[PDB]
Amino acid sequence: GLFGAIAGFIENGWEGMVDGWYGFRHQNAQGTGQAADYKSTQAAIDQITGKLNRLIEKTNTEFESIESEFSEIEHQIGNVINWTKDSITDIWTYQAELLVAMENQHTIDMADSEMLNLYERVRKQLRQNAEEDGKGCFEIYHACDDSCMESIRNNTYDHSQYREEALLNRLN
Amino acid sequence: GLFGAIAGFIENGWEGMVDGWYGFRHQNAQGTGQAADYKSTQAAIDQITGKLNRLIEKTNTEFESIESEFSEIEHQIGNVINWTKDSITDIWTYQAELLVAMENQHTIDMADSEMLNLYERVRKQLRQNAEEDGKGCFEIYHACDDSCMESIRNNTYDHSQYREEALLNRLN
Amino acid sequence: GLFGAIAGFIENGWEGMVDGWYGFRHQNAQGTGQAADYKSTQAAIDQITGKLNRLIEKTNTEFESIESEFSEIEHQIGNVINWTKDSITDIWTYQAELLVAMENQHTIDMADSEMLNLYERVRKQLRQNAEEDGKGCFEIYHACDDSCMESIRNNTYDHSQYREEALLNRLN
Amino acid sequence: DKICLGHHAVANGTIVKTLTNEQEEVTNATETVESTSLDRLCMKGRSHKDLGNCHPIGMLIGTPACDLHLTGTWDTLIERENAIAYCYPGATVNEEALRQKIMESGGISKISTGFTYGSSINSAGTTKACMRNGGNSFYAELKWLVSKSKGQNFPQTTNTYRNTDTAEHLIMWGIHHPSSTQEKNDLYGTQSLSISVGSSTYQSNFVPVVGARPQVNGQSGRIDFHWTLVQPGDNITFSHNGGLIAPSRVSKLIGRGLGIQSDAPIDNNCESKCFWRGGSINTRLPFQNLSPRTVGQCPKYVNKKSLMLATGMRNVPE
Amino acid sequence: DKICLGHHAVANGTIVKTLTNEQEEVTNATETVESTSLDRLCMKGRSHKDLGNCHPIGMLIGTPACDLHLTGTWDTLIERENAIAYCYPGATVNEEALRQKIMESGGISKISTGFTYGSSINSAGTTKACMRNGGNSFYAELKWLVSKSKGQNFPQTTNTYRNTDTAEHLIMWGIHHPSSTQEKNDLYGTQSLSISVGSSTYQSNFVPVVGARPQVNGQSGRIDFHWTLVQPGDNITFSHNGGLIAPSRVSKLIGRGLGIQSDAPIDNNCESKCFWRGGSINTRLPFQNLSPRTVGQCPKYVNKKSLMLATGMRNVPE
Amino acid sequence: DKICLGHHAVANGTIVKTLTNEQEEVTNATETVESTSLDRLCMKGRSHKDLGNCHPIGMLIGTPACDLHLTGTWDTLIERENAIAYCYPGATVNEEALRQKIMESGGISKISTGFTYGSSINSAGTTKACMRNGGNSFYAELKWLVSKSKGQNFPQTTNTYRNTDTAEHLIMWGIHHPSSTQEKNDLYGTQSLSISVGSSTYQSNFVPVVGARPQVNGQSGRIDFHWTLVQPGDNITFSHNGGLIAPSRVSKLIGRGLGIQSDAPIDNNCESKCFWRGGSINTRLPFQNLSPRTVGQCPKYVNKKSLMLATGMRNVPE
Numbered sequence A, B, C: 001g002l003f004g005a006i007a008g009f010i011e012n013g014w015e016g017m018v019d020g021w022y023g024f025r026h027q028n029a030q031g032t033g034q035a036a037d038y039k040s041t042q043a044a045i046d047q048i049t050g051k052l053n054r055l056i057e058k059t060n061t062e063f064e065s066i067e068s069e070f071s072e073i074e075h076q077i078g079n080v081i082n083w084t085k086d087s088i089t090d091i092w093t094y095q096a097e098l099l100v101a102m103e104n105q106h107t108i109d110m111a112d113s114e115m116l117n118l119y120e121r122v123r124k125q126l127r128q129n130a131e132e133d134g135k136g137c138f139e140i141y142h143a144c145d146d147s148c149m150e151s152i153r154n155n156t157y158d159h160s161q162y163r164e165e166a167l168l169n170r171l172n
Numbered sequence D, E, F: 001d002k003i004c005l006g007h008h009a010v011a012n013g014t015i016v017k018t019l020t021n022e023q024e025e026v027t028n029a030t031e032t033v034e035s036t037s038l039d040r041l042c043m044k045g046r047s048h049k050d051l052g053n054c055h056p057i058g059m060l061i062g063t064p065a066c067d068l069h070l071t072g073t074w075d076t077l078i079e080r081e082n083a084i085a086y087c088y089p090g091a092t093v094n095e096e097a098l099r100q101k102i103m104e105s106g107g108i109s110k111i112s113t114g115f116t117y118g119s120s121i122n123s124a125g126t127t128k129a130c131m132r133n134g135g136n137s138f139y140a141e142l143k144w145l146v147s148k149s150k151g152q153n154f155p156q157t158t159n160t161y162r163n164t165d166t167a168e169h170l171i172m173w174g175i176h177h178p179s180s181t182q183e184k185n186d187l188y189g190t191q192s193l194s195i196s197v198g199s200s201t202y203q204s205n206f207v208p209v210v211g212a213r214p215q216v217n218g219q220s221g222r223i224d225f226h227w228t229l230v231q232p233g234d235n236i237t238f239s240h241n242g243g244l245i246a247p248s249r250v251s252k253l254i255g256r257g258l259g260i261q262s263d264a265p266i267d268n269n270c271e272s273k274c275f276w277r278g279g280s281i282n283t284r285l286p287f288q289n290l291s292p293r294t295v296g297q298c299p300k301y302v303n304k305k306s307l308m309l310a311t312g313m314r315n316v317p318e
């Protein structure tokens, strides 16, 4: 897609992730874990909400009937009304389809960008202590225990603390 | 937003910047300085101008009156006319609202991208001589004076010149 | 543009490329070569095809005539009809112009996106074995024969094999 | 040493259309076209009149089936199928324009014409076609004027209604069309029949059509109705020597209201702003595939069964 | 030791409009507005009738030009410029509504009225303005009734057509307006002329009007046509003493069809769903700039010569 | 050793609506819906005729008020409220069609009919309702024919206008309806009144309404006008024996023009393409919320106070 993450370099979605749209899996000696990111999930969710709200805001134009349900209309005026009504219906059908095709394209790409943004945020936080694996994972060149993994998720990871160790490993 | 820069990894705008849309702030041995970036600013303004140009191009359909202001219109035809006029008005109201909502979504994301394009250009400019801080700044690992800063702004920064000094400070 | 590649950090297109939208130029010990990427070319073309299929989907609304070609309509009903028809035409003309302008904006940016997605896929593949030149090239820091070049294009390049040699060349 | 970023997926996704893909799978989606209708007229919050048997035009002329609907006020007027306007056979010229006026209104008031007639006129003419209380009757707002004495010449007669109110009044009258000259002679005399109607903004002549024709509700005669508006401070004169079905009351249309044609039963516990032949449409959705013919504030009709709008990302299962 | 990424380009591409740029060059673009028409009527898989010289109304009254078109079935009906409806000069009330009914239809049947006339009526009136087989004739579906003996009063006459079908029938009749009183007297007598017509849904009176007027096809007289729908089970009565042009047959409209007005030649080998005065539009494009007046299922008409849809990236030449 | 990237901001931005956010603050934004009207008719670059208190139809028959507008040329025609068409009371059949015709045209020429009358006809009928120079007069383009000898019968009269021009002309005539049988006799006699009017593409008859009605401008009698088009080369004949108001001239409509109904004053120092009841709309904006009833080349009416287009990035203040 537009931003290259969802159905891009991230190979598939996580079906066991039920408490968020985006999040983290980790792996270290202590084991594997999975937690959802709150900030990016709401960023996506709130933008979807905005669209729903726009969808449901109602006009106020009152229309009366120009066609009798129970009696015969004069043929010539009947034909003008029919032509006009069908013309209006074609416009709205086309508009409805354009609206939904367009919004859909947008929400999918929006969802992709929020995933990318979260990826970029983690990358910059990790700075010179980690390397991209190309599948949406970061390989970390210092010992990162459950607690270290947690600071990364919480945006409080301090790269100055691990830089010395991680640089040495990267050069091997 | 879409490209993660404006109201993204860059925390806030600069009110002090009155001579342009995108810019630089620097700090070194000789204090601080603030300059605008011409090319990114123009790219954005030009794209805005293009939309306003589209907004003001005039359809020349000449309409006549079908509704007398000064005498009574036969009731049936008057009702058809009213149904039709209101239908058309609902379409245009709907069109106008969608046009602007979409356009606004686009200009916001276009502007965001021009920030990201400027950022990415400078990132490559500095190559291995600097590191990202995550907040829209680059930490330069060598002595970079006012002549050096200007060359980054002017897009004439040669990285080979400082590579040796930079890499040494980057390791320690 | 939106993504910074096409009409951005990549200087221009290659007119020599006739079997692809996107691809590779290399220069090593054994000279130069050119190859188109099948995957990203088909990604872009499929989306273009998708749009063209939307463009041609028909509505089966059958319209009768409400205007005689060969005899005169009563003047008032004739004016109403003219007013309605012209209004309907202004809407479709507007819709048509908007659709095309929007689709075009989107296909240009989608094409830019695919170029960036290929670049990024290659950037991460090389890992630490190469560097960005800012004009869309990667400067590789090892002996990379035609056979190594093919593996980068084949997406089976293994940075492990060269990292030792490459890092030494980079740190000098 | 490994931290991986990712997104959620579901087992069974939903297909939506995008600009570039007819068959795109997303994690969730919601409908934008209303397919559901309430088969009731939702009348909560509405001062409504259900006309039942009564045709809106019958309110003006006073057909018996309209006796409960000769005056009143409403914000919502409901017309049913097979409603009766004409107990005695005939029709109104510009019928649909009139029907539409009554259904654009919020009420009806009735004002006397004050018309009186010399002793040579029998103004109490009646028909078996308009039954009331088991007796031959006539439209409540009009008088069937015939010669007191059978075969005698209906006298030359003038009646003028004056509008002293500050609104326009809607006046109606009828022309009787006999089924034979014998009947015409019996009712009105052997003279040539002429009906002239004149106001300051309207005038027309009327002549009774006489000829054989099918019996409708037992009658081969016909009474056709005609109408016009009389302006504040204006007068309307009738000049006639037989054949005029003369008004005894004229109407005044009050305010604005919404007119609905439907046979759906009324429900006072749901509220609605959109109505159609089959009932009420209560939706927050902007489109509907129920009917092209609706009244009120309505979702736009579209020729689509379904339009799903994505409320999630691309679904990329494992 | 270098690898470089790039995209293709062409020497010169096409200009398209975007939201932000009116002069945007791309590698490839395609037209969205149809500019081309087939200058013929594409009639493959259509049961069609080309009326040639026959005007749709002439089918119902049986004008000579229409003799091959008194009955038929079709799903597409084609009307040509200058088609003849009236041989004897005249016109039809509510003509355009009637023309549209015929053109919305899928066929015409005829049913005999059965009308017969006493020996003092001559039903064989003919005119040199309606030529058949080099001889004087008349509208096939109607009869010109005149007094058998010149100058005598046409007798009081009654004719009732009974619709025994389960479908409504279209009855037409004519009223003759003579060019002079002497002509009027010769044809129908010196008596005042009256024609009354009555169904259970329609009644009217008609009076022949003598008057000097210009010659059309050599005739200063006129025959004006009237029509009404007779319901299944209903009857329609004519009372007349001269001037009636009485129907010998009535029409029944069958099914639905598409009416087309064009002088484009018919082609049985191409198919189409969109027609206009100039021919047929066969396109997959959603828009069209040939004509605002089209019939069938058509691309939408737009006020643009050209509108290019980009099918490739930005063209950035070397 | 540090260089930071950023973007500008402001102290107070403006709110716009996006697809996702009703309340997005941006640096700058601009109005897309015009709310301002100019309260004059911007007539610069236009050859215009202000009709004052002359009604379009008055121009054809020659009401005193329209004496300065019987012929002329314009590209813009301006009708005012309460304009006079009929000095003598009456109406034109199909008035609104004719009004619109005149308002679609760019001029009027007048061509004499050449109608002369026998010495037993008085062509100089006048009225106190149409005053010229303080004297009883009549419509400039018409003549009120009455019997020369009071009460004695009006003779059968033929008048033919021949259109020898290369363009269709518009002919008008009136039918006088008396207020009593007495008045009817003095003017025309006892005979029944028949007015037949016939060209080769039109015919009709008229019977004049005799009956009491209100006084309008002191007159109970009425004159109702009728109109038809006469094609090049065609003749139109008037066969009449009383009650005809005969044309002394016919009209020719020239070119195309824009018709404006407004009471806003003319301003020759602004140009505009869009007009409404309250003045002119000259804006470059595509939308407009002043009035649904505009003429010319207009921005589309929308039901929106305001719609702001973002002309700058998100505003993220310090």
Ligand SMILES: *[C@@H]1O[C@H](CO)[C@@H](O[C@@H]2O[C@H](CO)[C@@H](O[C@@H]3O[C@H](CO[C@H]4O[C@H](CO)[C@@H](O)[C@H](O)[C@@H]4O)[C@@H](O)[C@H](O[C@H]4O[C@H](CO)[C@@H](O)[C@H](O)[C@@H]4O)[C@@H]3O)[C@H](O)[C@H]2NC(C)=O)[C@H](O)[C@H]1NC(C)=O
Binding pocket: A075, A076, A078, A079, A082, E104, E255, E256
């Ligand atoms: C303007 O547009 C409206 C709406 O489209 C038209 O009104 C329709 O007119 C058509 C005739 O073309 C009607 O269709 C006919 O319906 C018959 C059954 O009617 C019942 O069922 C429908 C179901 O929706 C109800 O609407 C209706 O009230 C009845 O309860 C069918 O029996 C007819 O079939 C015909 O064709 C077959 C061929 O298959 C023949 O064998 C038969 O002889 C038969 O004639 C027919 O389809 C339709 O009922 C109307 N719809 C509505 C909503 O009123 C106007 O006529 C149109 N005006 C114009 C062109 O002037």
Ligand SMILES: *[C@@H]1O[C@H](CO)[C@@H](O[C@@H]2O[C@H](CO)[C@@H](O[C@@H]3O[C@H](CO[C@H]4O[C@H](CO)[C@@H](O)[C@H](O)[C@@H]4O)[C@@H](O)[C@H](O[C@H]4O[C@H](CO)[C@@H](O)[C@H](O)[C@@H]4O)[C@@H]3O)[C@H](O)[C@H]2NC(C)=O)[C@H](O)[C@H]1NC(C)=O
Binding pocket: C074, C075, C076, C078, C079, C082, F104, F255, F256
């Ligand atoms: C609703 O809208 C329709 C469509 O616009 C109107 O119909 C048009 O009416 C105009 C008159 O304003 C017609 O224009 C006239 O055309 C004449 C030529 O005849 C043919 O023209 C083309 C040939 O390609 C065909 O479309 C058409 O079928 C004709 O066969 C010209 O002779 C006229 O020119 C005259 O005007 C100039 C002013 O510049 C004067 O100096 C001269 O008098 C000059 O001769 C004129 O241009 C047009 O043909 C009509 N179009 C169609 C498709 O019918 C309706 O009138 C309108 N209805 C209402 C009620 O307003």
Ligand SMILES: *[C@@H]1O[C@H](CO)[C@@H](O[C@@H]2O[C@H](CO)[C@@H](O[C@@H]3O[C@H](CO)[C@@H](O)[C@H](O[C@H]4O[C@H](CO)[C@@H](O)[C@H](O)[C@@H]4O)[C@@H]3O)[C@H](O)[C@H]2NC(C)=O)[C@H](O)[C@H]1NC(C)=O
Binding pocket: B074, B075, B076, B078, B079, B082, D104, D254, D255, D256
């Ligand atoms: C087609 O639409 C047009 C334009 O909307 C419409 O004309 C309008 O009709 C309304 C009546 O529905 C008129 O409104 C009146 O105008 C005056 C102001 O000049 C008001 O003060 C009036 O108030 C009265 O309304 C009450 C109803 O709620 C009455 O009970 C009482 O009399 C109040 O005093 C009233 O609103 C209005 O003048 C026009 N508008 C225009 C621009 O002409 C037209 O009738 C429609 N056509 C058909 C056939 O329905």
Ligand SMILES: CC(=O)N[C@@H]1[C@@H](O[C@@H]2O[C@H](CO)[C@H](O)[C@H](O[C@]3(C(=O)O)C[C@H](O)[C@@H](NC(C)=O)[C@H]([C@H](O)[C@H](O)CO)O3)[C@H]2O)[C@H](O)[C@@H](CO)O[C@H]1O
Binding pocket: D125, D126, D127, D128, D129, D136, D144, D146, D177, D178, D179, D183, D187, D218, D219, D220, D221, D222
């Ligand atoms: C005298 C009698 O009883 N005749 C029997 C026929 O009944 C009458 O038939 C005549 C037509 O010949 C009318 O239809 C009569 O209808 C009424 C009616 O009820 O509508 C009687 C009303 O009093 C009368 N109203 C007025 C104001 O005159 C009304 C009108 O005359 C007509 O409607 C005007 O068109 O008619 C009806 O009672 C009966 O049809 C016949 C067959 O069995 O037997 C006759 O003995």
Ligand SMILES: *[C@@H]1O[C@H](CO)[C@@H](O[C@@H]2O[C@H](CO)[C@@H](O)[C@H](O)[C@H]2NC(C)=O)[C@H](O)[C@H]1NC(C)=O
Binding pocket: D214, D215, E162, E200, E233, E234, E235
């Ligand atoms: C139209 O004419 C027919 C035939 O005259 C009428 O049919 C009659 O129906 C009645 C019942 O009402 C029966 O007594 C007979 O079957 C028919 N009468 C005769 C004398 O044959 C029909 O009623 C007439 N008019 C309509 C239906 O309006």
Ligand SMILES: *[C@@H]1O[C@H](CO)[C@@H](O)[C@H](O)[C@H]1NC(C)=O
Binding pocket: D162, D200, D233, D234, D235, F214, F215
């Ligand atoms: C109506 O009649 C009254 C009473 O005769 C009269 O005074 C009034 O002026 C008339 N009004 C009109 C408009 O003719």
Ligand SMILES: *[C@@H]1O[C@H](CO)[C@@H](O)[C@H](O)[C@H]1NC(C)=O
Binding pocket: E214, F162, F233, F234, F235
């Ligand atoms: C109309 O009048 C002319 C001239 O008097 C005459 O030749 C003929 O009767 C008519 N001609 C045409 C072309 O209508």
Ligand SMILES: *[C@H]1O[C@H](CO)[C@@H](O)[C@H](O)[C@H]1NC(C)=O
Binding pocket: D028, D029, D030, D031, D311
């Ligand atoms: C889709 O399901 C999600 C929960 O998984 C919910 O948030 C959303 O409202 C649902 N939409 C519909 C239409 O069911």
Ligand SMILES: *[C@H]1O[C@H](CO)[C@@H](O)[C@H](O)[C@H]1NC(C)=O
Binding pocket: E028, E029, E030, E311
């Ligand atoms: C545009 O040209 C290309 C070749 O460059 C071709 O493949 C394609 O079919 C053309 N586009 C369309 C829409 O036909």
